[PDB]
């Protein structure tokens, strides 16, 4: 006998800053959910970020292009800051080609359908020459958490192009999270609490989707908890009967062909035990008993899970 929280107004003060309110929280769970939600939000929220960049005229991170002022490393870090939203695919390859004097903004990227660059004003480099031109291809993957290059080294998988420039993936859109519990005066009630979650992100995830994802993950783990086995069992039997039933049964119970029958019969092979104990050579010597008969007895002891040895 309790209440439960209903998702209410979701304010957008800026594109990055959002406040989400929850009115009918039972007293005592205010902090519980505040804390759990904060934890999951900061920890596991899936986001997209640049994974690698390929520029032509550069073999390694440390050289320098003519006609640009940022060093290669600064271009990589700025790309690390690049906030990008892909809808359907997991790995997209963006192409940036610009020449002439000016600060390279994000908008100059060759614009694909599925890609949304939320803040095109993010600078990448500064050109300084009449003919200075940069071309590059950025490979962007989706992922969760924080993955540095050094672990990614295991999965080389033919990185053969030495032109590859690896950057650590900070797979996390949420930058900051706070929550406030305040007395939730509902028109007929004394002690209810309202949760106000203030969340600041890189401007990719909308608040409702984030909160729902977090609740989903918590729901999954608590479902995992719901069952608690405590079950026991007696099964453990003994595994070596007198001679193993599958070795006591008589040849007759094997049923083959009159020939093979009379063969075992007049060969003194009465039990599938004696049988499984005998080898080929044994039957090869019986008159009128040869390759085909024996081989048949074998193909049958094949499905009888017993061989001849």
């Amino acid at each position: 006998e309790f209440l439960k929280p209903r998702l209410v107004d979701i304010e957008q003060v800026s594109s990055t800053h959002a406040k989400v309110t929850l009115e009918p929280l039972e007293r005592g769970f205010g902090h519980t959910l505040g804390n759990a939600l904060r934890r999951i939000l900061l920890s596991s929220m899936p986001g997209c970020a640049v994974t690698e960049v390929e520029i032509d005229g550069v073999l390694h991170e440390y050289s320098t292009k003519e006609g640009v002022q940022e060093d290669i490393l600064e271009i990589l870090l700025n790309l690390k800051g690049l906030a990008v939203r892909v809808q359907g695919k997991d790995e997209v390859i963006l192409t940036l080609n610009k020449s002439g004097i000016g600060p390279v903004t994000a908008a100059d990227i060759t614009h694909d359908g599925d890609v949304e660059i939320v803040k095109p004003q993010h600078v990448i480099c500064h050109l300084t020459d009449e003919n200075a031109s940069i071309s590059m291809r950025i490979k962007v993957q989706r992922g969760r958490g924080y993955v540095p290059a050094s672990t990614r080294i295991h999965s080389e998988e033919d990185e053969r192009p030495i032109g590859r420039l690896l950057v650590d993936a900070c797979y996390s859109p949420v930058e900051r999270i706070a929550y406030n519990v305040e007395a939730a005066r509902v028109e007929q009630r004394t002690d209810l609490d309202k949760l106000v979650i203030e969340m600041e992100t890189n401007g990719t995830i909308d608040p409702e989707e984030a909160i729902r994802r977090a609740a989903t993950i918590l729901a999954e783990q608590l479902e995992a908890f719901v069952d608690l086995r405590d079950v026991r069992q007696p099964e453990v039997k003994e595994e070596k009967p007198e001679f193993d039933p599958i070795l006591l049964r008589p040849v007759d119970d094997l049923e083959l062909t009159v020939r093979s029958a009379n063969c075992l019969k007049a060969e003194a092979i009465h039990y599938i035990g004696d049988l499984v104990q005998r080898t080929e050579v044994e039957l090869l010597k019986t008159p009128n008993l040869g390759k085909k008969s024996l081989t048949e007895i074998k193909d049958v002891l094949a499905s009888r899970g017993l061989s001849l040895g």
Binding site: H60, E61, Y62, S63, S150, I153
Partner: protein
């Protein structure tokens, strides 16, 4: 030693008269080689890379 001679006879393993000495990367360091320099004394046949 004898037994290894027996092994060479068996498998026909022509023993290479040159030992390995290559300058391999020190243990537990991983990075990018940014530059190479080559110094040949005067007289010797410069290799293509030089």
């Amino acid at each position: 030693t004898p037994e290894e001679k027996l092994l060479r006879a068996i498998f026909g393993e022509k023993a290479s008269d040159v030992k390995d000495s290559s300058l391999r990367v020190p243990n537990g360091v991983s990075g990018t080689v940014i530059d190479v320099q080559v110094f040949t004394r005067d007289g010797v046949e410069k290799d293509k890379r030089a």
